[PDB]
Amino acid sequence: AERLSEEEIGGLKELFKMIDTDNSGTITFDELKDGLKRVGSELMESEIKDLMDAADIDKSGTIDYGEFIAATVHLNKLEREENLVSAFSYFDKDGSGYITLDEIQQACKDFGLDDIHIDDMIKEIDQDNDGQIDYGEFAAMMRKRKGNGGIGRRTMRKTLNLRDALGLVDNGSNQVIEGYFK
Ligand SMILES: [Ca+2]
Ligand SMILES: [Ca+2]
Ligand SMILES: [Ca+2]
Ligand SMILES: [Ca+2]
């Protein structure tokens, strides 16, 4: 052939194997990260599984050349959500501001959540009390409790509560189907 891929832009097809450089030509939960953590970028697990359900068109814990590009063009724009929001969306499924062990452990279906280990995890991730994770807990569960407004943990992290947002913004999307047409 003389024209089929998008090699004109940049080594993207390679960018795909650029990730699964040790697997076999597929991106699994492990290589999901291994790939971008190579170019310098640094994401957390939650981001991996977040990209699997939110980007992996065939969330099977493995991304192929196809699922790659569809998941690459997503991060290829003017988007901003490389923070806690990654899990805050999946982990904090209800996105109310907290995650009770139910939503926490549940979000770990691949972790084989158990009453032995993942159970202690309730208390292992529980940064303030209820074996739950809130925008603040999920925040202190990896970092610390800064004195800046950034705080969001449950009313116990200090003494004060928290300031309410001014409003949520969103772009939205439409209904499109692709398969035999490109
Ligand atoms: Ca791989
Ligand atoms: Ca797949
Ligand atoms: Ca919630
Ligand atoms: Ca808690």
Q: Judge whether 119 is annotated as a binding position.
A: no
Annotated binding residue 7: no
Please give all residues whose CB falls under 5 A of ion ligand 2, grouped by chain where several chains appear: 58, 60, 62
What's the CA gap between 153 and 147, in Å, rounded? Answer: 12
Dist CA 85 CA 59 (whole Å): 20
Q: By the 8 A CB rule, do 11 and 17 touch?
A: no
Q: How far is the CA of 7 from the centre of ligand 2 (A)?
A: 23
Residue 136 contacts residue 154 (beta carbons within 8 Å):
yes
| SS3 assignment for 103-168 | HHHHCCCCCCCCCCHHHHHHHHHCCCCCCEEECCHHHHCCCCCCCCCCCCCCCCCCCCCCCCCCCC
Nearest bound ligand to the CA of residue 28: 1
Tokens of 82: 């490389």
Ligand 2 centroid to Cα of residue 64, in Å, is 6
Is 62 annotated for ligand binding? yes
Q: How was this structure determined?
A: NMR
Where along the chain do the CATH 1.10.238.10 domains lie?
1-76, 77-182
How many C-beta atoms surround the C-beta of residue 26 within 10 A? Answer: 18
The Cα-based distances of 86 to 24, 49, 52 in angstroms read 27, 9, 11
- Convert 48-63 to b/e letters by CB count within 10 Å (16 or more is b): bbbbbeebbeeeebbb
Using alpha carbons, select from 168, 86, 68, 175 the residue that is nearest to residue 135: 86
Q: Tokens for 46? A: 């939650």
Rounded CA gap, 43 and 54, in Å? 15
The one-letter code for the residue type at 1 is A
d(CA 164, CA 161): 10
> What is the CATH T-level fold of the domain 77-182, as seen in this structure?
Recoverin; domain 1 (1.10.238)
d(CA 179, CA 182): 7
User: Any known ligand binding at 132?
Assistant: yes
Strand partners, 134: 98
For residue 63, the SS3 value is strand
Report the separation in Å between the CA atom of 174 and the middle of ligand 1, taken as the mean of its atom positions: 31
E strand spans, 7-64: 27-28, 62-63
Extract the tokens encoding 31.
């290589």
Task: Report the Cα–Cα distance between both ends of the chain, in Å, rounded.
Answer: 17
SS3 3: coil
- Which of helix, strand or coil describes residue 1? coil
Output the six-digit token pair for 117: 């280990």
Ligand 2 centroid–CA 129 distance in Å is: 38
Closest by Cα among 125, 118, 120 to 139: 125
CA angle 152, 155, 160 (to 5 degrees): 85
> Distance (Å, rounded) from C-alpha 97 to C-alpha 140?
14
Question: How would you label 80-92 residue by residue, b for 16+ Cβ within 10 Å and e otherwise?
Answer: eeeebbbbbebbb
Instruction: Using the mean position of ligand 2's atoms as its centre, give its distance from the Cα of residue 60 in Å.
Output: 5
Q: State yes or no: 60 annotated in a binding site.
A: yes
As its CATH architecture, domain 1-76 has Orthogonal Bundle (1.10)
